[PDB]
Amino acid sequence: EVQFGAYLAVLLGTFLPALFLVNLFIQTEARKAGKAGGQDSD
Amino acid sequence: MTGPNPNKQAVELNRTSLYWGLLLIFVLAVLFSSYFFN
């Protein structure tokens, strides 16, 4: 029998730092799209 | 509110750094899961 808090430690320890980096990459591309000036800037 | 802050900068994370960080977090999760589960 394994420790039940480790399911939270692994899955939140994966998803929350991964979604932080997905957040940082997406706003980097959205900032480049806004500065580009066409059809994706709005 | 005081004036608009002149120290405000933009933050970047290119696609290479995203792949490097996604790989780092998944591999650290692969490595440390067996120890956390014990």
């Binding site: 480790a6 399911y7 692994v10 899955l11 994966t14 | 792949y19 790989l23 692969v30």
Partner: peptide
């Protein structure tokens, strides 16, 4: 039940490797 977590982490790691190779930012000159 933890083998579900072990499988998901390994398959999830290989999916990152797939996107890092075939959806890479292409190096461009000029």
């Amino acid at each position: 039940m933890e083998a579900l977590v072990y499988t998901f982490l390994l398959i999830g790691t290989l999916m990152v490797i797939f996107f890092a190779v075939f959806f890479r930012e292409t190096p461009r000159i000029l």
